[PDB]
Amino acid sequence: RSQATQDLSEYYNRPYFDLRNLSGYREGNTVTFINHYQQTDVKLEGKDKDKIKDGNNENLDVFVVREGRQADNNSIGGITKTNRTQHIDTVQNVNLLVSKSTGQHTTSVTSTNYSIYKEEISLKELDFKLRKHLIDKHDLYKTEPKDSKIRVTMKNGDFYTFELNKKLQTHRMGDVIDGRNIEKIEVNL
Numbered sequence: 752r753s754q755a756t757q758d759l760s761e762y763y764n765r766p767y768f769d770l771r772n773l774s775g776y777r778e779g780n781t782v783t784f785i786n787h788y789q790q791t792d793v794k795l796e797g798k799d800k801d802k803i804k805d806g807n808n809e810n811l812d813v814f815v816v817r818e819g820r821q822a823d824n825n826s827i828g829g830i831t832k833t834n835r836t837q838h839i840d841t842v843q844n845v846n847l848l849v850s851k852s853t854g855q856h857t858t859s860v861t862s863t864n865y866s867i868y869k870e871e872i873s874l875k876e877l878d879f880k881l882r883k884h885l886i887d888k889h890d891l892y893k894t895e896p897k898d899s900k901i902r903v904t905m906k907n908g909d910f911y912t913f914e915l916n917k918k919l920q921t922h923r924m925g926d927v928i929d930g931r932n933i934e935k936i937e938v939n940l
């Protein structure tokens with residue numbers, strides 16, 4: 752197991768927090784959220800920079816992963832608009848198809864339902880949760896990942912690709928999509 756794959760395994764096994772309906776204060780390219788447990792400094796490194804207002808921003812969700820450098824609570828992207836109404840049921844049910852080739856002659860497919868609970872969702876959150884799922888259920892990063900990818904397809908045919916042999920690019924972590932319009936998620940291992 753390369754150091755590279757070891758490092759991916761370490762990163763995607765880190766704790767994450769899903770914080771809901773908080774205020775974020777923007778100064779420069781950092782947005783500070785505080786609750787009763789933690790303070791998080793969220794770095795804007797992409798087109799999120801054009802969306803978050805200078806100063807106070809209300810009613811945001813944040814998907815938090817602490818990046819590696821001491822006593823830091825730095826995270827990157829992961830900011831969304833909170834749900835406009837309460838959803839007790841899932842916002843959307845999505846077919847997740849994980850395909851795995853083993854040896855020379857075997858294909859295997861796991862087909863489940865993937866629960867979307869948020870009207871708007873960051874690529875950060877999709878990427879991190881799906882990889883953690885694959886670590887947990889499909890032995891991701893036990894072997895070299897090679898050309899392994901996730902693809903998220905929207906109802907209109909738009910799609911987003913996460914290549915599993917590197918981290919998600921930091922400029923993509925603050926990109927957001929409409930959870931209602933996700934159609935399916937396919938993974939090729």
Ligand SMILES: CO[C@@H]1O[C@H](CO)[C@H](O)[C@@H]2COC(C)(C)O[C@@H]12
Pocket residue numbers: 912913914
């Ligand atoms: C290689 O750079 C980007 O990486 C993504 C996967 O990491 C995804 O495939 C992107 C989708 O759209 C284009 C413009 C082809 O840019 C791609």
Ligand SMILES: [Zn+2]
Pocket residue numbers: 837838839840
């Ligand atoms: Zn409901």
